Amino acid sequence: EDFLQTGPERAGVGRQDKTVDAPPQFGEPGYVTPAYQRVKVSSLGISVFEDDANAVTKVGGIKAVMEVAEKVASGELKTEEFEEGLKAGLSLDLALEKMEEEAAAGDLLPDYLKPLPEDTPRKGMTWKNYVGR
Numbered sequence: 334e335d336f337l338q339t340g341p342e343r344a345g346v347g348r349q350d351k352t353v354d355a356p357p358q359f360g361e362p363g364y365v366t367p368a369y370q371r372v373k374v375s376s377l378g379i380s381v382f383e384d385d386a387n388a389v390t391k392v393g394g395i396k397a398v399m400e401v402a403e404k405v406a407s408g409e410l411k412t413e414e415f416e417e418g419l420k421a422g423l424s425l426d427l428a429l430e431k432m433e434e435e436a437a438a439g440d441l442l443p444d445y446l447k448p449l450p451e452d453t454p455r456k457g458m459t460w461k462n463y464v465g466r
Contacts, residue, residue: 368406
């Protein structure tokens, strides 16, 4: 045949034939920056110090910081009430729902303001004719 194909094939490197894409690092321009290293670390729940109820080790380690940081950089989470439930020892899968459902939904009206069926007068009962007090 003809010339060498794949030089290191009888040596330590495998193939050296075909070019491939490289996973880009933090500085080089193809990087999608993950949210666990660009967000302000105070705006996470987890605090970096080792012994607060919201330390990295007391929550689920390195993995827990990543899944919280997408909830922060997307805007899905609010940093104030999430940290508050985390200080009481609420584990993360049930800590994040507690802060989420507080300002999620409500009507908030007290019972004395919402109307009653006795508020409108009936069909043939009232003696009035002059609507008003």
